[PDB]
Structures are given as C-alpha cells and as structure tokens.
C-alpha cells in the first residue's frame, strides 16, 4: 500500500473513445463499480459511485 492516490478533475478524451464498435472481451474486468450511500442512517442522502 505504499503508493496512494491523489485525485482531481481532469480533461479527458472526447466521449467517443468509449464507443467500442466490437464486443468487449468479457474478461477485461479490471474496473468495477458499485453504488454507496453517502450518509448512512440518513434517509434522503446522495448516492455515490465507488469505482
């Protein structure tokens, strides 16, 4: 765990770079997403992605 991450808002490529025209190979599984409650025990909280 020696390297950690410092994250910020960055310019990225045009969103066409995400439009694959073939099938994605099903075992390219390095990236996962699941939703998390921002404030637990609290009701109407924003829902965040944990990528």
């Amino acid at each position, epitope marked *: 765990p020696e390297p950690t991450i410092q994250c910020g808002s960055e310019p990225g490529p045009s969103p066409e770079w995400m439009v694959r*025209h*073939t099938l994605t*190979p*099903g*075992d390219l*599984r390095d990236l996962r997403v699941e939703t998390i409650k921002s404030n637990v025990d609290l009701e109407d909280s924003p829902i965040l992605m944990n990528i």
Partner: antibody, heavy 117, light 107 residues
Framework: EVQLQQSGPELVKPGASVKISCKTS????????IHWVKQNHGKSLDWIGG????????TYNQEFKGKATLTVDKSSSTAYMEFRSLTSEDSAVYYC??????????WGQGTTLTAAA | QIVLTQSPAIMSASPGEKVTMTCSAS?????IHWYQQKSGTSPKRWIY???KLASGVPARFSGSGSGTSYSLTISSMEAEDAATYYC?????????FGSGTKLEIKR
C-alpha cells in the same frame, strides 16, 4: 431455469444458405452476450462470433466473416445465425451459448448442419 | 489473436492416479476457463476464472496458473472423468478455445 433451445437439424445441398435460431428463456435477454460455436464431428471447438442483444453489436472469428451473420430479436428473446454457401466442410454441430464475463455458463443443445449433394 | 496450446492432446490415467494437463497462451490473459465434454453432448463449464469450480464439479479438480501458463489438475483420477477438456480465453477478441485434452481410462 436458464435454457437455450436451438432450432432443429437441416440437411442441405452444398451452396445453400441456412439460418438457425437460438431461443432463450429464464433471464433478461439483453443482459448477456450470446456466442456461436462450431464443432466438427470428433474435433475441436471453433468460436464463430458473438452478439450483444442489447445493441446488436457483433464480433466474428475472421474465418467466418461474410459466411456467418448474427442477429437477435429482443421481442422473442431469440438469437439467429445465418451461414451462407455451405460446403461439406461445414457439416458439424453448431452451438449457441451464453456468457456474462469471459466464460460460457449455459449452452444450447446443438444444431447439426449437413451438406449433401 | 491469442491462441491456446493444450498438452497433452491425448492421455490415459488409472483410477486413483494424479492427472495434470496444461494450457499455454500465446500471450498473457486475465483468466482461463475449462470445459468438460463427453462424446455426444454439449461442453459443460468445469473450472472457470482459472481456479473456481462450477457447482457440483468434484473437488478433486483444481485449476491454477497466471500470465500465459495454466493447468487443470485431478488429484485422483475417477472413471467418470474420462472426457475431453478444453481451455478457453476471452481476454482479447476473438474468443478462442484450446485444441483439447482427451483423457482416457488406463486399465
């Protein structure tokens, strides 16, 4: 239970085209890729290609490009494969199969295609 | 473009002996999957994601490996194991199968 039910066998003159079907049930059709696999009698398994039923996107083994075409019909939860100009080398069992990641978890029962003059 | 080379192509084992078969990828893959096929039926998922057993598959089977080298191992051969075993990758297009290891019973 998940089931993939394929159309029945076809005996065909060399040079004809055929379209076989793969009827899926028991899951949300659009969430899983459908694959097609050729197996000559007693030999190895050859991937023909796959189709995403959500957007109709396809990818082929280039030895089958042009020869095979994959389609789906979401309303019937059915996948189709069209093989053109059959030769005697195309006589084989043809399977449809379901994946989510890179492996296949359910297989159809197979469709025999026979080329005979 | 990844091709999978399986060895041995054909082999026999007596019930109770240890069995190993290998699957070698022309370049690196994220996972390997194995299917069992007996004459006259569809292949069945056997080991997937390199080392996981599909439900019901006997625990005498195990998978291991990484990078380009993978193997399927049977700790103790049983007669119900005689079959052809195919490995398979879909880390790159096209989806590919290995040429298969046909496992027969020595007597």
């Amino acid at each position: 239970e998940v089931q993939l039910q394929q159309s029945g066998p076809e005996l065909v003159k060399p040079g004809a085209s055929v379209k076989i079907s793969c009827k899926t049930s028991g899951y949300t059709f659009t969430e899983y890729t459908i694959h097609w696999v050729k197996q000559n009698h007693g030999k190895s398994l050859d991937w023909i290609g796959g189709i995403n039923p959500n957007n109709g996107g396809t990818t082929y083994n280039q030895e089958f490009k042009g020869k095979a075409t994959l389609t789906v019909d979401k309303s019937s939860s059915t996948a189709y494969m069209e093989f053109r100009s059959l030769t005697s080398e195309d006589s084989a069992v043809y399977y449809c199969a379901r994946s989510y990641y890179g492996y296949v978890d359910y297989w159809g029962q197979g469709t025999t295609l026979t080329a005979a003059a | 473009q990844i091709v999978l080379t399986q060895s041995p192509a054909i082999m026999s084992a007596s019930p109770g002996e240890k069995v190993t078969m290998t699957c070698s990828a022309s370049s690196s893959i994220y996972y390997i999957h194995w299917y069992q096929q007996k004459s006259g039926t569809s292949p069945k998922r056997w080991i997937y994601d390199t080392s996981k057993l599909a439900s019901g598959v006997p625990a005498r089977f195990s998978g291991s490996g990484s990078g380009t080298s993978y193997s399927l191992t049977i700790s103790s051969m049983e007669a119900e194991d005689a079959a052809t075993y195919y490995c398979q990758q879909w880390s790159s297009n096209p989806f590919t199968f290995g040429s298969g290891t046909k496992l027969e019973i020595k007597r």
